[PDB]
Amino acid sequence: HMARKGIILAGGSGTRLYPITHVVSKQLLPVYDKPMIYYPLSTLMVAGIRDVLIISTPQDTPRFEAMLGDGSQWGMNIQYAVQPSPDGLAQAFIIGREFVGNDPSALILGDNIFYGHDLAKQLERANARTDGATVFAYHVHDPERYGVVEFDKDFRALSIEEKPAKPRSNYAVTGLYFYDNQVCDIAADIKPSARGELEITDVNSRYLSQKTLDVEIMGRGYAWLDTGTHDSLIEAATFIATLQKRQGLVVACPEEIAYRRKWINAEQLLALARPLSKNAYGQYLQNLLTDQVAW
Amino acid sequence: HMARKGIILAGGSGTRLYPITHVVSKQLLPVYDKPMIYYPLSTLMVAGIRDVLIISTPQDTPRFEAMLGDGSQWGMNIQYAVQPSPDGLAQAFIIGREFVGNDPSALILGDNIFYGHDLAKQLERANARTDGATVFAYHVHDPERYGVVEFDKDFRALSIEEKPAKPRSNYAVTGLYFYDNQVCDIAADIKPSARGELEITDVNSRYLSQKTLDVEIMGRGYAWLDTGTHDSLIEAATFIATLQKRQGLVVACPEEIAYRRKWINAEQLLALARPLSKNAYGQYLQNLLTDQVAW
Amino acid sequence: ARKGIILAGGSGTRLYPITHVVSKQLLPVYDKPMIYYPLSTLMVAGIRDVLIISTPQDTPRFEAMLGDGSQWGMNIQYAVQPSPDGLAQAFIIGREFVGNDPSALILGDNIFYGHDLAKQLERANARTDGATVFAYHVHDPERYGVVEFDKDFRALSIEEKPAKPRSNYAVTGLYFYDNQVCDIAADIKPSARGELEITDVNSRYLSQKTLDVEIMGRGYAWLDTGTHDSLIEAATFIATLQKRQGLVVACPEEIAYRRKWINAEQLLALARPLSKNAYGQYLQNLLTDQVAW
Amino acid sequence: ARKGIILAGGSGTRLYPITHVVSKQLLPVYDKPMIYYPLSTLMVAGIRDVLIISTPQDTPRFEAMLGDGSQWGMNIQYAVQPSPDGLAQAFIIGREFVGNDPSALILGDNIFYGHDLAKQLERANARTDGATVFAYHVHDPERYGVVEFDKDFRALSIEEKPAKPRSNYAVTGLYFYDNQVCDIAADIKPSARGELEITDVNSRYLSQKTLDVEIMGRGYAWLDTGTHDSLIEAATFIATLQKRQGLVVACPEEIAYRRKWINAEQLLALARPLSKNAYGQYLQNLLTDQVAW
Ligand SMILES: Cc1cn([C@H]2C[C@H](O)[C@@H](COP(=O)(O)OP(=O)(O)O[C@H]3O[C@@H](C)[C@H](O)[C@@H](O)[C@H]3O)O2)c(=O)[nH]c1=O
Ligand SMILES: Cc1cn([C@H]2C[C@H](O)[C@@H](COP(=O)(O)OP(=O)(O)O[C@H]3O[C@@H](C)[C@H](O)[C@@H](O)[C@H]3O)O2)c(=O)[nH]c1=O
Ligand SMILES: Cc1cn([C@H]2C[C@H](O)[C@@H](COP(=O)(O)OP(=O)(O)O[C@H]3O[C@@H](C)[C@H](O)[C@@H](O)[C@H]3O)O2)c(=O)[nH]c1=O
Ligand SMILES: Cc1cn([C@H]2C[C@H](O)[C@@H](COP(=O)(O)OP(=O)(O)O[C@H]3O[C@@H](C)[C@H](O)[C@@H](O)[C@H]3O)O2)c(=O)[nH]c1=O
């Protein structure tokens, strides 16, 4: 009976991308054909998480709620909470403490895109763990802006350093973390860092010192994209666009995932699609009931 | 003393791009490094128009106002009005009738990008006309979704047909129109078309029958981009991005145009830039005071 | 020891004029020539003996590019196809090359990318009999061989460019065969469109109940480059991944080194004359960059 | 009758391996080979006599592509550059070709696009003495000749790749010259970097007070393609414009027809063997598509 509680952290001071983020939050902006936040929401749904808390800024949380609602249209439970100030990833587990309660949980960042073959099998393995924590390591060209994993010769994780001056490897900790029921108390016990933030690296290092942290390599066959620059936002959009145009399939379509997980039935999906029948996205939903696709 | 009144029509039912436009209006979405509406706002400013009325939907007009304010930060006058229902381009001159008053005017669409050499000279020539109307004709591959100009052998405009089944040419009327003080009364006199809209083509055909319509060809050396599909939105963004990265210059930067037109002075521009000093856009503003550029 | 064939011949004039005097598979996909990608796919499958088939005009160009493969601890040979008379003709041109060994054919303009691709190719390479092809959901299946699947995705038929495709699953341009294929290819007759059809070869294995049709899931990119637009899209796709990762897709030097077909001294030697460009710097950094494999 | 030179020789190995066996200026920019663009720029200037300079290895490839130009009512000849020893060497290799006429040099990998470009090139082509070059604001001027401008944008100096560039204006890769240039190029000596410098030729005209330095404004695209990324960016830029307009950039057949260098019967004849691809269909539609010129 594993009902993991998912958190999407979708706040952030939001100034690197000025002026496109001046009055619209980054995680509501389009990545090709759908808002950014559809992708990490979909990642949680593909992991099996059906209870999702969306955290954003005081000003933008009504905007996320106007877009996703309570999630019942997708047979899910989506709730909202605000982060007054962007004081660190680990504050998600203080703001989301009541939502998490006594259950296992997962945190994903609202601007992180995960894509690749067998991603579901890897997320389901992380979701099924009853103890400890699971994070993922991914080779990037700029590891120094992330938590960086030091690996021994067999890729067992030895340490995690947040934004090291000399990174021990190129493997960054991705923005997706699975935890057991210790994390809320761990997050409440840690102190702000020199840069003034409650550090997810400190949470992860606590599990590491207990020898209960699983650090899974996300291989180069996966795309783990964040979108920190105007250029990389375009690059994520064209990357998504090339795949969808080639396949005739949509990445991170929550209606599709909900239907495939039996969270909604064929009548409900048709009901979502009928008012969207005049656009391409509604046509894809309509065609899910006829097009044989391996899932 | 030519103080032309500019209107940006930035409403629209907004469903072709679902779901990216579900809770954010299309004209607030990014085209590379800045919101879409910066481009037609800039076009008006490059034409010399300093008084701008922004029309959008009831729901999104506060959003445009939160982003542009009253324009005094750029030494301009920007006002707002709502379109309850998207009943046609020519309704802009009913909603904006009081704003226009007894002055000449210009209408530009909130999702139209205009770019090219000597665009300013062409817009200033259209702006300086004391009588009649000036519209622009542009060769597109899909003229049939636009007002289409029929030309004689010397490219004198003979007729304009809105969305013809068999287009007489490939020249579409762009989404930028200059009018004398007849347009508000002309717009109030016309009747909705079979498709239920107050047609700008009917306004333009009225000037045409008076022999006071100037139809100027916008040559293929210009980019006139609207962004009707997910694909063409990306294509406009990468197009802008290639030029700006090559030149080290920004397209449709309103601060720059305001400074160059002496609507704001060096102290004011520095003041806009100082709180933006941590991002690339603020660095470009800061560098306008030192970088010698022909304008 | 499976023998690989890369079919890199005449693609027609659809892309005119970019292919007017340069064969398509010599043209860049972002940062390296197109044929590097299917070459790398064969190497990832473990195939070390490769026959490159091209037009007579461009065989010295492919040979000038890849050499005999000994620089990567491989064996690369060349053969010509005077006229592009069908995929299955590769097994006539390469009959001597294949001999009595198993083989694989890949198209010189097909890109394959995704997680665990190696595990799937090694499983196909390790089969002792029959054939393996892969099925991939595309929006325009009718320009390919199309797989008809039952409810359990068992393959029932393969039709070359059907008017009404029975599914959206196209047969990708990568095929593994046992020692029957050369004799089969020699036995089939030109089709209505005048070509020796890989679909007829594959349909033979299916009717013999020795064809494995494996789904290549949507987590994979299977890209060909049949239009000017899709050539661009393949280039920007690769570019997004390499810029993000700091890693290069389809770097044959890297693959040979990781498979121990060449050692560090040989890799440094390949790198030194390239030290002034980014590609040679990437090879040099392979000796220090810890990458999981 | 001004004589045009396209310098399309050796660019080094920065783009390795995409240029390893194919010269860069034969490679595609979206839908046509790179050299089509500077070729078209010369034709838009009115230049009808073109010398293509390339490496010895690729001169048959350029010639296989463009022919003698008589198919477009032009005169196209070929010459080789054994070693890439400087832009100004084009006027030594092409000394016989230029003779006593005026000339223009354009780089085989430079793209020029924008409104009224023709009016500007025709004004340069119509000058009776001196030289004309163009200055363009770029983010990395230090990799070019850089123009020093006074407050009125009168040119004061040109420095080749200065450490501290005096402005952001680079000299673009398109130059118009009177009959002095060949003798000047024969007179200059290799520079510190070992090249015969176009900046030394241009600085000679400036000191003689016969150099016109014209700003090419930001409304123009002046694109070279020195990196893998910028080659992609040039391709997607062209693609965005052609898809929007239904028009093709740098179509030599179109330019020759509009300038009446070939007539409709000759254009139909060029089109007929290409009727099965989009390029030949575009030529055919030129006879019906009313386009302002
Ligand atoms: C700090 C913070 C960020 N955010 C948002 C803003 C961004 O969209 C996103 C990440 O912001 P950043 O400043 O980059 O956080 P960050 O600097 O903490 O980066 C993190 O990145 C992870 C991927 C690594 O695994 C971590 O180890 C860590 O490096 O989260 C919040 O909403 N609230 C916050 O408190
Ligand atoms: C009709 C309408 C549109 N809009 C917005 C929505 C879009 O962003 C933009 C244009 O919407 P459309 O449905 O395409 O309008 P449209 O169908 O009227 O197209 C017009 O296009 C011009 C370029 C041509 O010159 C005209 O002749 C005409 O063809 O204006 C409004 O805000 N209010 C309205 O009343
Ligand atoms: C026919 C042929 C093609 N080719 C080249 C041209 C192209 O680069 C590439 C493919 O050419 P086409 O005309 O598309 O081949 P094709 O039309 O035979 O396509 C094939 O595609 C496969 C992916 C499917 O599995 C097959 O079932 C089949 O549909 O191979 C040759 O070199 N020689 C030939 O004999
Ligand atoms: C030097 C040289 C280059 N080339 C080719 C290689 C490239 O495609 C192209 C340019 O080569 P480069 O090394 O960049 O040349 P370059 O370094 O001389 O660059 C020149 O660029 C012009 C735009 C400026 O106006 C000049 O002032 C100068 O900066 O010409 C030759 O064919 N022959 C040669 O002799």
Side-chain angles (χ1 to χ4, degrees), chain A residues 9 11-12 27 83 86-89 109 111 146-147 162-163 173-175 177 195 197 200-201:
Chain A
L9 183 60
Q27 307 89 347
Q83 203 190 1
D87 299 330
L89 268 58
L109 296 176
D111 58 357
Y146 295 116
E162 182 59 40
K163 289 163 172 66
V173 178
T174 77
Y177 323 85
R195 63 168 183 164
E197 293 177 39
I200 208 66
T201 289

PDB file of all heavy atoms in Angstrom, chain A residues 9 11-12 27 83 86-89 109 111 146-147 162-163 173-175 177 195 197 200-201, ligand 1:
ATOM      1  N   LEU A   9       8.480  21.611  -6.530  1.00  0.00           N
ATOM      2  CA  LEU A   9       8.890  22.919  -6.046  1.00  0.00           C
ATOM      3  C   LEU A   9       8.931  23.874  -7.226  1.00  0.00           C
ATOM      4  O   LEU A   9       9.798  23.751  -8.107  1.00  0.00           O
ATOM      5  CB  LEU A   9      10.229  22.826  -5.333  1.00  0.00           C
ATOM      6  CG  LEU A   9      10.735  24.113  -4.709  1.00  0.00           C
ATOM      7  CD1 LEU A   9       9.749  24.638  -3.670  1.00  0.00           C
ATOM      8  CD2 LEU A   9      12.077  23.821  -4.109  1.00  0.00           C
ATOM      9  N   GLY A  11       8.675  27.516  -7.239  1.00  0.00           N
ATOM     10  CA  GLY A  11       8.870  28.889  -6.826  1.00  0.00           C
ATOM     11  C   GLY A  11      10.146  29.438  -7.422  1.00  0.00           C
ATOM     12  O   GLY A  11      10.454  29.209  -8.596  1.00  0.00           O
ATOM     13  N   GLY A  12      10.889  30.195  -6.628  1.00  0.00           N
ATOM     14  CA  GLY A  12      12.099  30.749  -7.185  1.00  0.00           C
ATOM     15  C   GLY A  12      12.000  32.226  -7.431  1.00  0.00           C
ATOM     16  O   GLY A  12      11.051  32.669  -8.086  1.00  0.00           O
ATOM     17  N   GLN A  27       7.989  28.192 -14.538  1.00  0.00           N
ATOM     18  CA  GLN A  27       7.372  26.874 -14.663  1.00  0.00           C
ATOM     19  C   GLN A  27       5.993  26.896 -15.322  1.00  0.00           C
ATOM     20  O   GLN A  27       5.401  25.832 -15.500  1.00  0.00           O
ATOM     21  CB  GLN A  27       7.296  26.209 -13.283  1.00  0.00           C
ATOM     22  CG  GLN A  27       8.635  26.203 -12.613  1.00  0.00           C
ATOM     23  CD  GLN A  27       8.918  27.429 -11.775  1.00  0.00           C
ATOM     24  OE1 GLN A  27       8.213  28.464 -11.850  1.00  0.00           O
ATOM     25  NE2 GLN A  27       9.979  27.345 -11.010  1.00  0.00           N
ATOM     26  N   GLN A  83       5.655  29.350  -0.899  1.00  0.00           N
ATOM     27  CA  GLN A  83       6.978  29.579  -0.324  1.00  0.00           C
ATOM     28  C   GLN A  83       7.151  31.091  -0.273  1.00  0.00           C
ATOM     29  O   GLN A  83       7.302  31.723  -1.326  1.00  0.00           O
ATOM     30  CB  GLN A  83       8.088  28.935  -1.183  1.00  0.00           C
ATOM     31  CG  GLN A  83       9.390  28.639  -0.425  1.00  0.00           C
ATOM     32  CD  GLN A  83      10.569  28.221  -1.299  1.00  0.00           C
ATOM     33  OE1 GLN A  83      10.468  28.141  -2.532  1.00  0.00           O
ATOM     34  NE2 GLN A  83      11.648  27.785  -0.641  1.00  0.00           N
ATOM     35  N   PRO A  86      12.457  32.183  -1.308  1.00  0.00           N
ATOM     36  CA  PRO A  86      13.120  30.957  -1.838  1.00  0.00           C
ATOM     37  C   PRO A  86      14.346  30.537  -1.025  1.00  0.00           C
ATOM     38  O   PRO A  86      15.502  30.771  -1.371  1.00  0.00           O
ATOM     39  CB  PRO A  86      13.474  31.366  -3.270  1.00  0.00           C
ATOM     40  CG  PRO A  86      13.678  32.858  -3.183  1.00  0.00           C
ATOM     41  CD  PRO A  86      12.711  33.375  -2.142  1.00  0.00           C
ATOM     42  N   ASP A  87      14.106  29.904   0.120  1.00  0.00           N
ATOM     43  CA  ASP A  87      15.165  29.695   1.099  1.00  0.00           C
ATOM     44  C   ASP A  87      15.796  28.312   1.016  1.00  0.00           C
ATOM     45  O   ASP A  87      16.529  27.922   1.930  1.00  0.00           O
ATOM     46  CB  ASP A  87      14.631  29.950   2.511  1.00  0.00           C
ATOM     47  CG  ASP A  87      14.128  31.373   2.698  1.00  0.00           C
ATOM     48  OD1 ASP A  87      14.656  32.302   2.041  1.00  0.00           O
ATOM     49  OD2 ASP A  87      13.197  31.568   3.513  1.00  0.00           O
ATOM     50  N   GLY A  88      15.549  27.572  -0.062  1.00  0.00           N
ATOM     51  CA  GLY A  88      16.234  26.312  -0.276  1.00  0.00           C
ATOM     52  C   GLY A  88      15.294  25.160  -0.566  1.00  0.00           C
ATOM     53  O   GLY A  88      14.158  25.114  -0.089  1.00  0.00           O
ATOM     54  N   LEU A  89      15.781  24.218  -1.378  1.00  0.00           N
ATOM     55  CA  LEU A  89      15.020  23.023  -1.737  1.00  0.00           C
ATOM     56  C   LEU A  89      14.467  22.283  -0.517  1.00  0.00           C
ATOM     57  O   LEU A  89      13.361  21.726  -0.574  1.00  0.00           O
ATOM     58  CB  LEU A  89      15.918  22.092  -2.566  1.00  0.00           C
ATOM     59  CG  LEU A  89      15.907  22.217  -4.065  1.00  0.00           C
ATOM     60  CD1 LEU A  89      16.301  23.639  -4.521  1.00  0.00           C
ATOM     61  CD2 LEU A  89      16.856  21.176  -4.689  1.00  0.00           C
ATOM     62  N   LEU A 109      11.867  19.238  -9.001  1.00  0.00           N
ATOM     63  CA  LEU A 109      11.835  20.671  -9.288  1.00  0.00           C
ATOM     64  C   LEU A 109      10.914  20.971 -10.482  1.00  0.00           C
ATOM     65  O   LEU A 109      10.890  20.226 -11.471  1.00  0.00           O
ATOM     66  CB  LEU A 109      13.253  21.178  -9.542  1.00  0.00           C
ATOM     67  CG  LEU A 109      14.284  21.106  -8.388  1.00  0.00           C
ATOM     68  CD1 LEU A 109      15.667  21.554  -8.857  1.00  0.00           C
ATOM     69  CD2 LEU A 109      13.848  21.926  -7.202  1.00  0.00           C
ATOM     70  N   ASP A 111      11.059  22.932 -12.916  1.00  0.00           N
ATOM     71  CA  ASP A 111      11.689  23.261 -14.193  1.00  0.00           C
ATOM     72  C   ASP A 111      12.614  22.150 -14.701  1.00  0.00           C
ATOM     73  O   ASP A 111      13.364  22.379 -15.660  1.00  0.00           O
ATOM     74  CB  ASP A 111      12.438  24.612 -14.090  1.00  0.00           C
ATOM     75  CG  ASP A 111      13.509  24.631 -13.004  1.00  0.00           C
ATOM     76  OD1 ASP A 111      13.649  23.604 -12.278  1.00  0.00           O
ATOM     77  OD2 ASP A 111      14.210  25.680 -12.851  1.00  0.00           O
ATOM     78  N   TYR A 146      25.918  22.542  -9.249  1.00  0.00           N
ATOM     79  CA  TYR A 146      25.043  21.548  -8.652  1.00  0.00           C
ATOM     80  C   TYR A 146      25.681  20.886  -7.443  1.00  0.00           C
ATOM     81  O   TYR A 146      26.876  21.022  -7.191  1.00  0.00           O
ATOM     82  CB  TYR A 146      24.717  20.462  -9.663  1.00  0.00           C
ATOM     83  CG  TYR A 146      23.916  20.918 -10.859  1.00  0.00           C
ATOM     84  CD1 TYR A 146      24.473  20.866 -12.146  1.00  0.00           C
ATOM     85  CD2 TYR A 146      22.574  21.297 -10.727  1.00  0.00           C
ATOM     86  CE1 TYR A 146      23.749  21.221 -13.245  1.00  0.00           C
ATOM     87  CE2 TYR A 146      21.827  21.668 -11.843  1.00  0.00           C
ATOM     88  CZ  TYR A 146      22.431  21.618 -13.115  1.00  0.00           C
ATOM     89  OH  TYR A 146      21.770  21.942 -14.268  1.00  0.00           O
ATOM     90  N   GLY A 147      24.887  20.077  -6.741  1.00  0.00           N
ATOM     91  CA  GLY A 147      25.468  19.056  -5.880  1.00  0.00           C
ATOM     92  C   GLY A 147      26.210  18.039  -6.741  1.00  0.00           C
ATOM     93  O   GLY A 147      25.683  17.579  -7.755  1.00  0.00           O
ATOM     94  N   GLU A 162      27.926  20.461  -2.476  1.00  0.00           N
ATOM     95  CA  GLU A 162      27.074  21.447  -3.134  1.00  0.00           C
ATOM     96  C   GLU A 162      27.951  22.531  -3.765  1.00  0.00           C
ATOM     97  O   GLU A 162      28.693  23.225  -3.060  1.00  0.00           O
ATOM     98  CB  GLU A 162      26.102  22.073  -2.132  1.00  0.00           C
ATOM     99  CG  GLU A 162      25.130  23.079  -2.749  1.00  0.00           C
ATOM    100  CD  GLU A 162      24.269  22.444  -3.835  1.00  0.00           C
ATOM    101  OE1 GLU A 162      23.839  21.291  -3.630  1.00  0.00           O
ATOM    102  OE2 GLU A 162      24.020  23.100  -4.873  1.00  0.00           O
ATOM    103  N   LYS A 163      27.881  22.662  -5.087  1.00  0.00           N
ATOM    104  CA  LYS A 163      28.618  23.676  -5.839  1.00  0.00           C
ATOM    105  C   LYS A 163      30.110  23.718  -5.515  1.00  0.00           C
ATOM    106  O   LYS A 163      30.653  24.785  -5.182  1.00  0.00           O
ATOM    107  CB  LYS A 163      27.985  25.048  -5.643  1.00  0.00           C
ATOM    108  CG  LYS A 163      26.616  25.102  -6.378  1.00  0.00           C
ATOM    109  CD  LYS A 163      25.724  26.261  -5.923  1.00  0.00           C
ATOM    110  CE  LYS A 163      24.479  26.398  -6.807  1.00  0.00           C
ATOM    111  NZ  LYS A 163      23.590  25.211  -6.647  1.00  0.00           N
ATOM    112  N   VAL A 173      23.737  15.795  -9.062  1.00  0.00           N
ATOM    113  CA  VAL A 173      22.527  15.199  -8.495  1.00  0.00           C
ATOM    114  C   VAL A 173      21.340  15.827  -9.204  1.00  0.00           C
ATOM    115  O   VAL A 173      21.200  17.052  -9.182  1.00  0.00           O
ATOM    116  CB  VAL A 173      22.450  15.441  -6.972  1.00  0.00           C
ATOM    117  CG1 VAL A 173      21.150  14.872  -6.353  1.00  0.00           C
ATOM    118  CG2 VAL A 173      23.622  14.817  -6.269  1.00  0.00           C
ATOM    119  N   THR A 174      20.499  15.008  -9.868  1.00  0.00           N
ATOM    120  CA  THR A 174      19.382  15.613 -10.594  1.00  0.00           C
ATOM    121  C   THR A 174      18.373  16.196  -9.619  1.00  0.00           C
ATOM    122  O   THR A 174      18.459  15.989  -8.402  1.00  0.00           O
ATOM    123  CB  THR A 174      18.643  14.620 -11.486  1.00  0.00           C
ATOM    124  OG1 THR A 174      17.787  13.780 -10.668  1.00  0.00           O
ATOM    125  CG2 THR A 174      19.613  13.783 -12.272  1.00  0.00           C
ATOM    126  N   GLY A 175      17.424  16.973 -10.160  1.00  0.00           N
ATOM    127  CA  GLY A 175      16.395  17.569  -9.315  1.00  0.00           C
ATOM    128  C   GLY A 175      15.197  16.672  -9.012  1.00  0.00           C
ATOM    129  O   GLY A 175      14.045  17.114  -9.070  1.00  0.00           O
ATOM    130  N   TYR A 177      14.264  13.484  -6.126  1.00  0.00           N
ATOM    131  CA  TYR A 177      14.700  12.874  -4.878  1.00  0.00           C
ATOM    132  C   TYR A 177      13.536  12.097  -4.273  1.00  0.00           C
ATOM    133  O   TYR A 177      12.427  12.633  -4.169  1.00  0.00           O
ATOM    134  CB  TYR A 177      15.144  13.946  -3.866  1.00  0.00           C
ATOM    135  CG  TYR A 177      15.870  15.118  -4.487  1.00  0.00           C
ATOM    136  CD1 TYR A 177      15.158  16.195  -5.015  1.00  0.00           C
ATOM    137  CD2 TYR A 177      17.258  15.162  -4.533  1.00  0.00           C
ATOM    138  CE1 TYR A 177      15.796  17.279  -5.576  1.00  0.00           C
ATOM    139  CE2 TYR A 177      17.923  16.251  -5.115  1.00  0.00           C
ATOM    140  CZ  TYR A 177      17.171  17.297  -5.645  1.00  0.00           C
ATOM    141  OH  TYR A 177      17.766  18.386  -6.215  1.00  0.00           O
ATOM    142  N   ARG A 195      25.422  30.258   1.994  1.00  0.00           N
ATOM    143  CA  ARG A 195      24.653  31.025   1.019  1.00  0.00           C
ATOM    144  C   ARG A 195      23.211  31.280   1.475  1.00  0.00           C
ATOM    145  O   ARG A 195      22.415  31.814   0.690  1.00  0.00           O
ATOM    146  CB  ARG A 195      24.669  30.355  -0.361  1.00  0.00           C
ATOM    147  CG  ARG A 195      24.028  28.959  -0.456  1.00  0.00           C
ATOM    148  CD  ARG A 195      23.817  28.502  -1.939  1.00  0.00           C
ATOM    149  NE  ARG A 195      23.137  27.203  -1.988  1.00  0.00           N
ATOM    150  CZ  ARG A 195      22.539  26.685  -3.061  1.00  0.00           C
ATOM    151  NH1 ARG A 195      22.517  27.363  -4.201  1.00  0.00           N
ATOM    152  NH2 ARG A 195      21.954  25.488  -2.982  1.00  0.00           N
ATOM    153  N   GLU A 197      20.709  29.019   2.512  1.00  0.00           N
ATOM    154  CA  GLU A 197      19.649  28.131   2.064  1.00  0.00           C
ATOM    155  C   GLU A 197      19.638  26.833   2.852  1.00  0.00           C
ATOM    156  O   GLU A 197      20.671  26.381   3.354  1.00  0.00           O
ATOM    157  CB  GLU A 197      19.782  27.827   0.557  1.00  0.00           C
ATOM    158  CG  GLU A 197      19.529  29.064  -0.274  1.00  0.00           C
ATOM    159  CD  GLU A 197      19.727  28.837  -1.757  1.00  0.00           C
ATOM    160  OE1 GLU A 197      19.348  27.755  -2.244  1.00  0.00           O
ATOM    161  OE2 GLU A 197      20.274  29.742  -2.421  1.00  0.00           O
ATOM    162  N   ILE A 200      19.329  20.771   0.072  1.00  0.00           N
ATOM    163  CA  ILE A 200      18.982  19.377  -0.194  1.00  0.00           C
ATOM    164  C   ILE A 200      20.225  18.509  -0.148  1.00  0.00           C
ATOM    165  O   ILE A 200      20.137  17.316   0.164  1.00  0.00           O
ATOM    166  CB  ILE A 200      18.231  19.189  -1.535  1.00  0.00           C
ATOM    167  CG1 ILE A 200      17.326  17.947  -1.449  1.00  0.00           C
ATOM    168  CG2 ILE A 200      19.183  18.990  -2.722  1.00  0.00           C
ATOM    169  CD1 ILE A 200      16.164  18.075  -0.429  1.00  0.00           C
ATOM    170  N   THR A 201      21.396  19.073  -0.473  1.00  0.00           N
ATOM    171  CA  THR A 201      22.624  18.298  -0.340  1.00  0.00           C
ATOM    172  C   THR A 201      22.851  17.873   1.103  1.00  0.00           C
ATOM    173  O   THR A 201      23.311  16.751   1.348  1.00  0.00           O
ATOM    174  CB  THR A 201      23.818  19.089  -0.901  1.00  0.00           C
ATOM    175  OG1 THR A 201      23.698  19.126  -2.321  1.00  0.00           O
ATOM    176  CG2 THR A 201      25.210  18.468  -0.517  1.00  0.00           C
TER     177      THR A 201
HETATM  178  C1  LIG E   1      16.248  27.597  -3.754  1.00  0.00           C
HETATM  179  C2  LIG E   1      14.877  27.489  -4.346  1.00  0.00           C
HETATM  180  C3  LIG E   1      14.656  27.236  -5.643  1.00  0.00           C
HETATM  181  N1  LIG E   1      13.404  27.086  -6.187  1.00  0.00           N
HETATM  182  C4  LIG E   1      13.265  26.710  -7.609  1.00  0.00           C
HETATM  183  C5  LIG E   1      13.966  27.678  -8.554  1.00  0.00           C
HETATM  184  C6  LIG E   1      14.401  26.776  -9.704  1.00  0.00           C
HETATM  185  O1  LIG E   1      13.345  26.582 -10.656  1.00  0.00           O
HETATM  186  C7  LIG E   1      14.708  25.455  -8.989  1.00  0.00           C
HETATM  187  C8  LIG E   1      16.157  25.237  -8.634  1.00  0.00           C
HETATM  188  O2  LIG E   1      16.728  26.467  -8.139  1.00  0.00           O
HETATM  189  P1  LIG E   1      18.228  26.619  -7.855  1.00  0.00           P
HETATM  190  O3  LIG E   1      18.622  28.000  -7.447  1.00  0.00           O
HETATM  191  O4  LIG E   1      19.056  26.153  -9.098  1.00  0.00           O
HETATM  192  O5  LIG E   1      18.585  25.615  -6.673  1.00  0.00           O
HETATM  193  P2  LIG E   1      19.985  25.022  -6.212  1.00  0.00           P
HETATM  194  O6  LIG E   1      21.045  26.047  -6.318  1.00  0.00           O
HETATM  195  O7  LIG E   1      19.773  24.607  -4.749  1.00  0.00           O
HETATM  196  O8  LIG E   1      20.466  23.747  -7.102  1.00  0.00           O
HETATM  197  C9  LIG E   1      20.132  22.465  -6.718  1.00  0.00           C
HETATM  198  O9  LIG E   1      19.971  21.858  -7.989  1.00  0.00           O
HETATM  199  C10 LIG E   1      19.618  20.463  -7.913  1.00  0.00           C
HETATM  200  C11 LIG E   1      19.231  20.016  -9.307  1.00  0.00           C
HETATM  201  C12 LIG E   1      20.765  19.695  -7.255  1.00  0.00           C
HETATM  202  O10 LIG E   1      20.388  18.332  -7.120  1.00  0.00           O
HETATM  203  C13 LIG E   1      21.018  20.300  -5.870  1.00  0.00           C
HETATM  204  O11 LIG E   1      22.135  19.684  -5.227  1.00  0.00           O
HETATM  205  C14 LIG E   1      21.274  21.797  -5.966  1.00  0.00           C
HETATM  206  O12 LIG E   1      22.501  22.019  -6.661  1.00  0.00           O
HETATM  207  O13 LIG E   1      13.902  25.450  -7.788  1.00  0.00           O
HETATM  208  C15 LIG E   1      12.268  27.236  -5.414  1.00  0.00           C
HETATM  209  O14 LIG E   1      11.140  27.247  -5.881  1.00  0.00           O
HETATM  210  N2  LIG E   1      12.501  27.468  -4.086  1.00  0.00           N
HETATM  211  C16 LIG E   1      13.727  27.595  -3.468  1.00  0.00           C
HETATM  212  O15 LIG E   1      13.789  27.697  -2.250  1.00  0.00           O
END
